[PDB]
Scaffold this motif. Structure first.
Motif, PDB file in Angstrom:
ATOM      1  N   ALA B   2      11.000  -0.399 -33.344  1.00  0.00           N
ATOM      2  CA  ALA B   2      11.002  -1.761 -33.751  1.00  0.00           C
ATOM      3  C   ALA B   2       9.824  -2.421 -34.295  1.00  0.00           C
ATOM      4  O   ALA B   2       8.642  -1.858 -33.798  1.00  0.00           O
TER       5      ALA B   2
ATOM      6  N   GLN C 417      12.833  -3.767 -18.539  1.00  0.00           N
ATOM      7  CA  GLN C 417      11.447  -4.122 -18.153  1.00  0.00           C
ATOM      8  C   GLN C 417      10.731  -2.665 -17.988  1.00  0.00           C
ATOM      9  O   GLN C 417       9.372  -2.563 -18.307  1.00  0.00           O
ATOM     10  N   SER C 424      13.018  -1.593 -25.283  1.00  0.00           N
ATOM     11  CA  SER C 424      13.342  -2.698 -24.316  1.00  0.00           C
ATOM     12  C   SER C 424      14.227  -3.526 -25.223  1.00  0.00           C
ATOM     13  O   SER C 424      15.184  -3.913 -24.773  1.00  0.00           O
ATOM     14  N   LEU C 425      14.125  -3.548 -26.535  1.00  0.00           N
ATOM     15  CA  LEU C 425      15.050  -4.090 -27.326  1.00  0.00           C
ATOM     16  C   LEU C 425      16.328  -3.738 -27.725  1.00  0.00           C
ATOM     17  O   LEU C 425      17.302  -4.248 -27.423  1.00  0.00           O
ATOM     18  N   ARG C 432      23.167  -7.146 -23.519  1.00  0.00           N
ATOM     19  CA  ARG C 432      24.407  -8.024 -24.332  1.00  0.00           C
ATOM     20  C   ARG C 432      25.699  -7.407 -24.704  1.00  0.00           C
ATOM     21  O   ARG C 432      26.515  -8.164 -24.723  1.00  0.00           O
ATOM     22  N   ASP C 448      36.346 -22.424 -21.395  1.00  0.00           N
ATOM     23  CA  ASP C 448      34.971 -22.300 -21.778  1.00  0.00           C
ATOM     24  C   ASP C 448      34.324 -21.089 -21.445  1.00  0.00           C
ATOM     25  O   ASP C 448      33.902 -20.920 -20.458  1.00  0.00           O
ATOM     26  N   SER C 450      31.429 -19.808 -22.628  1.00  0.00           N
ATOM     27  CA  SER C 450      29.977 -20.176 -22.533  1.00  0.00           C
ATOM     28  C   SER C 450      29.802 -20.505 -20.791  1.00  0.00           C
ATOM     29  O   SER C 450      29.065 -19.564 -20.298  1.00  0.00           O
ATOM     30  N   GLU C 451      30.480 -21.414 -20.391  1.00  0.00           N
ATOM     31  CA  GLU C 451      30.193 -21.717 -19.134  1.00  0.00           C
ATOM     32  C   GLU C 451      30.555 -20.966 -17.897  1.00  0.00           C
ATOM     33  O   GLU C 451      29.722 -20.472 -17.093  1.00  0.00           O
ATOM     34  N   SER C 454      28.025 -17.960 -18.145  1.00  0.00           N
ATOM     35  CA  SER C 454      26.501 -18.313 -17.632  1.00  0.00           C
ATOM     36  C   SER C 454      26.807 -18.427 -16.142  1.00  0.00           C
ATOM     37  O   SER C 454      25.651 -17.925 -15.584  1.00  0.00           O
ATOM     38  N   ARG C 457      26.802 -14.972 -14.643  1.00  0.00           N
ATOM     39  CA  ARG C 457      25.469 -14.338 -14.908  1.00  0.00           C
ATOM     40  C   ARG C 457      24.415 -14.757 -13.757  1.00  0.00           C
ATOM     41  O   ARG C 457      23.790 -14.230 -13.159  1.00  0.00           O
ATOM     42  N   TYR C 461      23.052 -12.487 -10.851  1.00  0.00           N
ATOM     43  CA  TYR C 461      21.742 -12.227 -10.737  1.00  0.00           C
ATOM     44  C   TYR C 461      21.096 -12.623  -9.451  1.00  0.00           C
ATOM     45  O   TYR C 461      20.113 -12.132  -8.909  1.00  0.00           O
TER      46      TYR C 461
ATOM     47  N   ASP D  27      21.986 -25.069 -14.468  1.00  0.00           N
ATOM     48  CA  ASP D  27      23.424 -24.640 -14.878  1.00  0.00           C
ATOM     49  C   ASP D  27      23.231 -24.021 -16.364  1.00  0.00           C
ATOM     50  O   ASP D  27      22.383 -24.091 -17.119  1.00  0.00           O
ATOM     51  N   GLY D  28      24.427 -23.412 -16.680  1.00  0.00           N
ATOM     52  CA  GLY D  28      24.436 -22.614 -17.819  1.00  0.00           C
ATOM     53  C   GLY D  28      24.332 -23.412 -19.248  1.00  0.00           C
ATOM     54  O   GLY D  28      23.514 -23.129 -20.010  1.00  0.00           O
ATOM     55  N   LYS D  29      24.909 -24.725 -19.289  1.00  0.00           N
ATOM     56  CA  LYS D  29      24.724 -25.511 -20.422  1.00  0.00           C
ATOM     57  C   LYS D  29      23.514 -25.654 -20.744  1.00  0.00           C
ATOM     58  O   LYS D  29      22.937 -25.569 -21.932  1.00  0.00           O
ATOM     59  N   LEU D  32      20.874 -22.209 -21.371  1.00  0.00           N
ATOM     60  CA  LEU D  32      20.997 -21.725 -22.831  1.00  0.00           C
ATOM     61  C   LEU D  32      19.746 -22.457 -23.616  1.00  0.00           C
ATOM     62  O   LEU D  32      19.451 -21.983 -24.260  1.00  0.00           O
ATOM     63  N   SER D  61       6.637  -7.273 -27.932  1.00  0.00           N
ATOM     64  CA  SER D  61       7.264  -6.624 -26.969  1.00  0.00           C
ATOM     65  C   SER D  61       6.199  -5.935 -25.921  1.00  0.00           C
ATOM     66  O   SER D  61       6.495  -6.299 -24.549  1.00  0.00           O
ATOM     67  N   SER D  65       6.186  -7.802 -22.180  1.00  0.00           N
ATOM     68  CA  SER D  65       6.275  -6.742 -20.818  1.00  0.00           C
ATOM     69  C   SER D  65       4.998  -6.657 -19.882  1.00  0.00           C
ATOM     70  O   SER D  65       5.554  -6.720 -18.786  1.00  0.00           O
TER      71      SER D  65
END
Lengths: 76, 521, 517, 66
Positions: B2, C417, C424-425, C432, C448, C450-451, C454, C457, C461, D27-29, D32, D61, D65
């Motif tokens: 990269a 990490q 890492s990328l 993703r 929805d 996205s909601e 999220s 996730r 997590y 929250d997610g909204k 992001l 990077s 890290s």
């Protein structure tokens, strides 16, 4: 025939160099020589020069011919 | 792996600018050396100019590209510092630009290229300085020989025997031996139509550019005279409102003359109170320097008058005489006056020059005013140009002592040493140093091409001979080949080469730092 | 002009652009069909008299012609899913397209060859598979019923075979050889001993690992606390080919002395073995008397003619390794075996290995009357074991609704990490790509995306969370409470196939134009 | 005055880490947007490395890290 739109060397005007300009100068000098050759020697032939108004003169004098000969070129 | 995204495309603009600069450099390259090809340019006014001078060619080309104009600044800097080699700096800039383009084609970041080129230029300057031939300003004979060698390439050949010592003395008058930086502008060259080349004078003081009082009664000279600079005119008052002189009979002439004489007498008395015997009045386009009645009164006062003095001449007089200009008669005093042993006009056909000697002013600079004479304009112009070139050469020697043989020998030596040293370098630095060393060979290649010699043969012979010599083996026009240029009397000051390298490196750095252009309107 | 017949190599820039974008575009044909709530796609024929609407990803891919060679390659590689599982081709294609898109984005950010990207994808896929294996659950409760079913299946398979002599005995043997492994059911973990001098009904079961062709001339018949290392060295019959070589010798005695010196030169390597703390040595080739004596002086047991299959199985059971040279002392992996015994079965020598470190293998001894009977018995046992192994592949399930996928993405992010910055990328890109699946599932469900993504996730997590996507109510619910699970085999196969497909196209620099058909 | 922070992008990366920490407890909204702000903050050292003529991605990077 002539070089233009070089797309490089952005100057105040056009540029011609190398073999092209050398040949142009040589051709201009050859044209002048062809114009003036007929007057060489006492047995040579004269020529007629015409101005931009409508008058003309005839003479076999090389110096006068060259003085009145209009050549639009640095070699001239 | 990269690496940086490089979303933008500054490479297009950078490469376009590099291409334009390289085109200009290639155009200017063919004029290098004594056998350089002449260039013909038709100006916007229709005039046709043919010259082999790089600076003149660049000026007449009317460069439009903003980046390409940097070469004009480089040439101006070279003239200001070195005074010669404007073609060499442009050629070096073009070669370094080509090397930078090649490096970019290899994926090297422009900042890396610029930094590595700066480091390589520093190393090259150090290398060239280490191998220079030492000179000493205390050796007047050496300076005279150097001046004669420099003048031998000019139109004036047999008068170099006199021109060289004149230049040496003029430069020494202001440079001494350890003055370090010295401004050659303190030496004023004055051209005059008439005489021959041998009719030149150094004059440790200052020389005027106009005649003395041509009317009857003018002293034309004065001994033990104080000199002051005047910017005003000795004329009667002119009120801003309507005013004029109307005479219908000779009887009014008495009143008019009395009034004008009273005013001019007050002015002349104010001048005399300061004990000023030489009046150097700046030229003006509105009124004459001194009125006829004022001139007569000054003649009665035995005061010399010199008029029509240009502003530059006034500034040089102030620098050399140590006096200050007088804005108006109200500020005319004695503290702002000089003291010369003798100020006189040399009454001779075609010169009629007034000169000042014996300034004896500790606060004044040791300026020099050289008188240049010549029957024709060509003679005086050539003499002035040759003298200026000699003065510049000696000044360059003063700033950085040392002489380097010409013919491209130092370039080849630097290239060889840098090539040898780069083997110890690592990373992009080694590659960039190798490219810099390769580009350094442009100058000898251009000299060989302009001289009609085989480039490969010339460079190979120079490199082979450098196995024993360092700088003395170079290209000589006289021998039409590779020979001992040192024995051929082809040398240049170290300052010239060092400044050329530095200017080339700086110009390359500036060009590489350009990534975009925008209009400000 | 290059090649011909409309099949020519495209410019590097356009070649890579095709290889990535066209391959990614294949997903768009089936992306809308992902999940039970996917959309329908219309396929129209030239005549328009045979057009049809279907939501099957495999049918869409196989019916719509693909002119771009990259799409052809992607589809051909993804076809393995149908043979392996027969379902989920849409998921494989979508995951491959997302991985390719992420790799293209990385390349646009690096403009460097994707070999590092390939390595990062390999590491991320390994981490994700490990996480998925950890997150799997077992539905094989009541193993007694499974054992009875295995016995019945074995009896069914043994019919019409030579093993029918004792159907119950052979069914029990086959069932045990799979059940007692408690791990991999591959035939490599099961050894078959073919000897004569009895009836097939007398077959014996041995949980230990048994080899043939006993070793050694002066070696002991019993080895205890063995430290086993395998090497591939020519300790016997050195200088195999010497015909035609000119020897600067006066007689054959000096040639023999030179050969002896060449053999002695191996003493350095032989001694290097002792510096590893090794007391048992296994060699693929035979061992001559001199190296055998050298090993004896060092107290190292010398095992000869271990070949390849024997070496592999012995290392697998003992957890050892096979090397060709000893570069540095104390740097190697050693196996363990509590007891090794020299035994003879059917007047044939055999080597018995017991107490192998974490050994997971079984052995079946066959006593036949002729070669045909033993070969038929071996083939029938292999077939029966292959059939019975199906029970150890089913009942393995993972939490559905993207819970397992989100856990795998979290594991990949964790791996991102503890890795060099240049990878890492790539690891984050793989994470993703894994996360893209629940987003597409939510989008196809009309909620929805996205909601929901999220929230899922954040829940996953934030520790021991079993939540997942609720495509019926458009919210987040506990999958374990709702009993929403999906086959572990399906997810593992889909992820492996997607990773392989991404790797196949990543290593490609330029693609030649496909010939129109 | 007289108050400073660690240079060379250290402050930007610390801010990005704090923002990412905030992005988890929200929250997610808005999460992001918080992540986007963190990315924008991290972009600064990338540009600094680019102007310096080094491997911007590698340096960024590695710094993140570390």
């Amino acid at each position: 025939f002539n070089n233009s739109r070089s797309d490089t060397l952005f100057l105040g005007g056009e540029k011609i160099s190398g073999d092209d300009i050398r040949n142009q100068n040589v051709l201009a000098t050859m044209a002048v020589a062809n114009v003036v050759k007929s007057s060489l020697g006492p047995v040579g032939l004269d020529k007629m020069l015409v101005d931009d108004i409508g008058d003309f003169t005839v003479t076999n004098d090389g110096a006068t011919i060259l003085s009145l000969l209009d050549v639009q070129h640095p070699a001239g | 792996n990269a690496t940086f995204k490089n979303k933008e495309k500054p490479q297009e603009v950078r490469k376009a600018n590099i291409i334009a600069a390289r085109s200009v450099a290639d155009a200017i390259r063919t004029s290098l050396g004594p056998k350089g090809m002449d260039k013909m340019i038709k100006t916007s006014r229709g005039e046709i100019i043919i010259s082999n001078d790089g600076h003149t060619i660049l000026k007449q080309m009317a460069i439009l590209h903003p980046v390409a104009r940097m070469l004009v600044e480089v040439s101006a800097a070279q003239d200001s510092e070195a005074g010669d080699g404007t073609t060499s700096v442009v050629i070096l800039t073009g070669a370094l630009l080509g090397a930078a383009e090649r490096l970019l084609n290899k994926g090297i970041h422009p900042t890396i290229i610029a930094d590595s080129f700066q480091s390589a230029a520093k190393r090259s300057v150090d290398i060239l300085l280490e191998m220079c031939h030492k000179v000493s300003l205390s050796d007047r004979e050496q300076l005279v020989r150097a001046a004669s060698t420099s003048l031998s390439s000019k139109i004036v050949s047999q008068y170099s025997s006199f021109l060289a010592p004149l230049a040496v003395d003029s430069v020494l008058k202001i440079s001494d031996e350890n003055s370090k930086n010295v401004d050659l502008n303190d030496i004023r060259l004055v051209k005059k139509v008439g005489g021959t080349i041998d009719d030149t004078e150094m004059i440790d003081g200052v020389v005027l550019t106009q005649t003395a009082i041509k009317s009857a009664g003018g002293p034309t000279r004065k001994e033990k005279a104080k000199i002051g600079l005047i910017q005003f005119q000795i004329s009667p008052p002119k009120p801003d409102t309507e005013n004029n002189i109307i005479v219908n009979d000779y009887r009014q002439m008495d009143k008019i003359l009395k009034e004008e004489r009273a005013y001019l007498l007050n002015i002349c008395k104010k001048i005399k109170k300061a004990k000023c015997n030489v009046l150097l009045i700046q030229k003006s386009i509105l009124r004459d320097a001194v009125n006829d009645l004022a001139l007569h009164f000054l003649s009665k006062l035995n005061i010399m008058v010199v008029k029509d003095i240009e502003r530059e001449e006034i500034e040089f007089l102030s620098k050399g005489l140590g006096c200050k200009p007088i804005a108006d008669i109200e500020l005319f005093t004695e503290d702002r006056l000089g003291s010369a042993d003798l100020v006189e006009e040399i009454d001779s056909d075609g010169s009629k020059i007034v000169r000042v000697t014996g300034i004896r002013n500790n606060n004044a600079r040791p300026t020099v005013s050289v008188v240049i004479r010549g029957a024709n304009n060509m003679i005086i112009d050539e003499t002035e140009r040759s003298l200026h070139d000699a003065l510049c050469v000696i000044r360059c020697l003063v700033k950085e002592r040392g002489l380097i043989a010409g013919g491209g020998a130092p370039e080849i030596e630097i290239s060889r040493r840098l090539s040898k040293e780069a083997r110890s370098m690592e990373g992009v630095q080694a590659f960039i140093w190798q490219e810099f060393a390769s580009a350094l060979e442009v100058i000898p290649t251009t000299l060989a091409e302009n001289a009609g010699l085989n480039s490969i043969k010339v460079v190979t012979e120079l490199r082979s001979k450098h196995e024993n010599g360092e700088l003395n083996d170079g290209i000589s026009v006289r021998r039409s080949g590779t020979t001992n240029t040192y024995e051929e009397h082809i040398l240049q000051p170290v300052l010239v080469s060092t400044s050329a390298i530095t200017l080339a490196s700086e110009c390359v750095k500036s060009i590489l730092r350009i990534d975009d252009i925008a209009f400000s309107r | 002009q290059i090649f011909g017949d409309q099949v020519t190599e495209e410019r590097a820039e356009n070649a890579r652009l095709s290889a990535f974008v066209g391959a990614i575009a294949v997903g768009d044909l089936v992306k809308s069909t992902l999940g039970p709530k996917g959309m329908d796609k219309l396929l129209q024929s030239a005549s328009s008299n045979t057009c049809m609407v279907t939501n099957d990803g495999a049918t869409i891919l196989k019916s719509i012609p693909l002119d771009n060679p990259a799409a052809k390659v992607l589809v051909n590689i993804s076809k393995v899913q149908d043979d392996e599982v027969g379902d989920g081709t849409t998921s494989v294609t979508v995951l491959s397209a997302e991985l390719l898109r992420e790799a293209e984005k990385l390349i646009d950010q690096s403009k460097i060859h994707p070999q590092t990207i390939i390595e990062g994808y390999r590491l991320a896929s390994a981490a994700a598979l490990d996480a998925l294996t950890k997150a799997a659950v077992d539905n094989s409760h009541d193993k007694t019923m499974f054992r009875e079913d295995l016995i019945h299946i074995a009896k069914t398979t043994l019919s019409s075979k030579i093993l029918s002599q004792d159907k119950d005995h052979f069914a029990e043997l086959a069932t045990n050889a799979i059940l007692r492994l408690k791990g991999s059911t591959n035939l490599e973990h099961i050894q078959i001993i073919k000897i004569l001098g009895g009836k097939l009904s007398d077959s014996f079961l041995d949980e230990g690992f048994i080899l043939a062709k006993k070793f050694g001339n002066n070696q002991p018949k019993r080895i205890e606390n063995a430290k086993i290392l395998i090497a591939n060295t020519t300790l016997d019959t050195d200088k195999v080919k010497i015909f035609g070589t000119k020897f600067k010798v006066d007689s054959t005695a000096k040639l023999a002395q030179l050969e002896k010196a060449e053999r002695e030169k191996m003493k350095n390597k032989i001694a290097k073995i002792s510096k590893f703390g090794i007391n048992t040595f296994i060699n693929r080739q035979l061992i001559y008397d001199y190296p055998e004596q050298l090993f004896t002086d060092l107290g190292i047991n010398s095992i000869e003619h271990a070949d390849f299959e024997g070496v592999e199985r012995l290392a697998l059971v003992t957890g050892g390794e096979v090397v060709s040279t000893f570069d540095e002392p104390s740097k190697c992996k050693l196996g363990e075996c509590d007891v090794i015994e020299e035994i003879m079965l059917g007047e044939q020598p055999f080597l018995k290995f017991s107490g192998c470190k974490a050994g997971e293998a079984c052995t079946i001894v066959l006593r036949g009357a002729t070669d045909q009977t033993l070969d038929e018995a071996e083939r029938s046992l292999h077939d029966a074991l292959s059939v019975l192994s199906q029970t150890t592949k089913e009942t393995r399930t993972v939490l559905g609704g993207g819970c397992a996928e989100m856990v795998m993405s979290k594991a990949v992010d964790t791996e991102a990490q503890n890795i060099d910055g240049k990878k890492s990328l790539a690891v984050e890109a793989f994470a993703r790509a894994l996360r893209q699946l629940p987003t597409i599932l939510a989008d196809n469900a009309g909620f929805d995306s996205s909601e929901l993504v999220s929230k899922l996730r954040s829940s996953i997590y934030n520790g021991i969370s079993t939540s997942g996507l609720d495509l019926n109510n458009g919210t987040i619910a506990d999958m374990r409470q709702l009993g929403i699970v999906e086959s572990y085999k399906l997810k593992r196969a889909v992820v492996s196939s997607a990773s392989e497909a991404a790797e196949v196209l990543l290593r490609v620099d330029n693609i030649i134009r496909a010939r129109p058909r």
